[PDB]
Design a protein around this ligand. Structure first.
Ligand SMILES: Nc1ncnc2c1ncn2[C@@H]1O[C@H](COP(=O)(O)OP(=O)(O)OP(=O)(O)O)[C@@H](O)[C@H]1O
Ligand SMILES: Nc1ncnc2c1ncn2[C@@H]1O[C@H](COP(=O)(O)OP(=O)(O)OP(=O)(O)O)[C@@H](O)[C@H]1O
Ligand SMILES: [Mg+2]
Ligand SMILES: [Mg+2]
Lengths: 343, 343
């Protein structure tokens, strides 16, 4: 069957909720973005950054988890033969309490997350302020200055040599005081990548376009992957969203399968085509309908956990201007030819 | 009976005062908001913030206490088997002495409040500057810097894994020196909730509306619960307020039960429909009556401990602006569909 296992109706509420939460659906936009990211991570070819722009509810974190799992699986059979190598290191950027981004905490937490192998792996990193402990976790004193932590992190990266270096929620890199300091931040990241030869992938919302093409040297070693949502002007995206809604309602662990394709306009209204937001909405609706033990979902149930109109109104405002910066037209190509003299 | 026990008349005034103090009434708005908050807490579904707006007088603190007690009771049967688990942790935000909201005190106070379990729970907090003592109290020195406290708090939250982390008086988060820093504070909170996976509930007055819509990412993961007051324009709210007044006068431990529905316009005028204001005003009147040993209450007595016209006039100005900003109309949906192209 193309739907959920019908045995779940005998199971209690927790099992059905867990099954619905653990389900990952495959849709064309996620598939194409995942394929492009796999291709650009297989060989960087003189690139140090992968910029993955995606709106609030597009699947950035779950895509990162999926690619992390696939990279670990692909590295597994040679990992049995080759040691001193991690497949992938995944970290998330921290929004600082102060006005500027704190690089010392970033470096120490990068060392913490990267350095969790089995205790047999000993390297004796540089600087005397970094070591192991009795629990096997790296201890970092408060007296170590930021360049020392950077040198130790560089040594760890060049030793382990991960395939990619994931920095989730990369929007937090833009919290600085000086207007021009954005270039300096991105150049610091580039310098960290260069000595280690480690491809960095930055995941963030459409705000991350502030780091897009702020320098030509940085523009050369960056790859722009757009995790586009589903539009409404294009009938193809509308049909894709309808099909994904059909797949979701097909696999909902309920006694009566609800009909959802009728109010596709309603579902698009409160999700803007985002897939993670729709999945969370359906999860909350399922939890509500399963607390009352109702054999189905009712419209008013969708109205209960739907996001506020003000919330969805503004999300479109930042998405619409975000896509405008990412819009590539034939006019831009012609100006490139005219500037280059190739006309 | 539907009112206070008649035996309390023989008892001295202290027990009558205590009984009226601990007595709590159930009214439709409080029940609805409590149900919504419990539903949101049970299945956050990728939501890290619950912004519980409400005027000063709606019962936000009492709602928080009731939710805390009910969650503790619900988690008790599972807490019998599984240990090292706190059902719910609640802390109150502190208005800073300086011009900026300090985060070091917030982190250390969250660590103190979160970590008060049975001494058998040992988790060896990160960073060497935080440890236990001879009296079971968390020791935090001035040696540690704010990122170290943040790391220790994050590890403690991950290990304990509370269902929800209540933050009362959340308006104090707005004490900043820069306008963009107001968004930066919420970004820091979002990162803290993301990297630990702990649901954060913000309870505050209508000045919390400055945190309502800012960045699409924050809007996607921020539930809005409105603890609306009882308006006078709608007859249903007037009837509910009159029912609350009637049960309050039924529950007043006096030899003679006064007539309170008659002066419902006055109460309102001096309470604006907030149940907490009515409750504490009646508490003051009853305390005066018990001090005078008077069998009943008079309007005069109400006039003695009422609220000044200037006080209530400032109340309605902030409430009027708070409800105006939170007003969701069908016209607003029309622009959203028109902007989305679904009209
Ligand atoms: N294809 C998918 N299948 C199942 N669940 C998905 C899918 N895409 C997203 N989700 C859900 O979305 C959530 C993960 O967050 P998601 O990656 O969608 O966020 P984002 O909006 O891209 O980023 P951010 O966390 O920065 O706002 C999880 O609840 C996950 O179940
Ligand atoms: N439903 C209720 N039944 C009884 N007493 C209530 C009720 N709601 C509020 N109170 C009273 O209100 C007081 C608690 O403060 P309350 O939560 O009402 O304040 P608030 O205005 O919502 O919040 P804040 O403290 O931020 O101003 C107590 O005196 C409590 O007895
Ligand atoms: Mg995400
Ligand atoms: Mg209160």
């Amino acid at each position: 069957s193309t739907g959920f296992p019908l045995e779940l109706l005998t199971r209690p509420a927790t099992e059905r909720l867990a099954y619905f939460e653990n389900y990952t659906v495959a849709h064309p936009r996620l598939k194409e973005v995942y394929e492009i990211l796999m291709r650009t991570i297989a060989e960087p070819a003189g690139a140090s950054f992968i910029f993955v722009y995606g709106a609030s509810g597009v699947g950035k974190t779950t895509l990162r988890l999926r690619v992390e799992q696939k990279l670990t699986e692909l590295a597994l059979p040679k990992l049995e033969s080759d040691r001193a190598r991690v497949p992938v290191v995944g970290i998330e950027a921290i929004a600082p309490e102060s006005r500027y981004f704190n690089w010392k905490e970033y470096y120490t937490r990068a060392l913490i997350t990267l350095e969790e192998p089995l205790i047999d792996h000993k390297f004796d990193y540089g600087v005397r302020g970094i070591s192991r402990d009795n629990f096997g976790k790296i201890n970092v004193e408060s007296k170590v200055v930021a360049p020392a932590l950077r040198r130790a992190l560089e040594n760890a990266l060049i030793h382990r040599h991960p395939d990619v270096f994931f920095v989730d929620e990369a929007q937090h890199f833009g919290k600085v005081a000086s207007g021009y300091k954005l270039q300096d931040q991105l150049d610091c990241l580039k310098s960290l990548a260069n000595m280690t030869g480690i491809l960095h992938c930055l995941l963030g919302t459409y705000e991350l376009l502030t780091f897009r093409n702020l320098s030509g040297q940085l523009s050369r070693r960056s790859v722009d992957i757009h995790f586009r949502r589903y539009c409404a002007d294009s009938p193809e995206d509308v049909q894709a969203f309808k099909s994904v809604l059909l797949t979701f309602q097909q696999h909902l662990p309920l006694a009566e399968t609800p009909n959802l394709v009728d109010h596709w306009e309603y579902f698009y209204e409160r999700t803007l085509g985002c897939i993670g937001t729709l999945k969370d909405w359906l999860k909350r609706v399922l939890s509500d309908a399963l607390d009352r033990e109702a054999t189905t979902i009712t419209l008013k149930d969708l109205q209960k956990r739907a996001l506020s109109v003000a919330q969805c109104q503004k999300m479109f405002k930042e998405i619409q201007e975000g896509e405008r910066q990412l819009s590539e037209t034939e006019a831009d190509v012609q100006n490139l030819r005219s500037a280059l003299g190739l006309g």
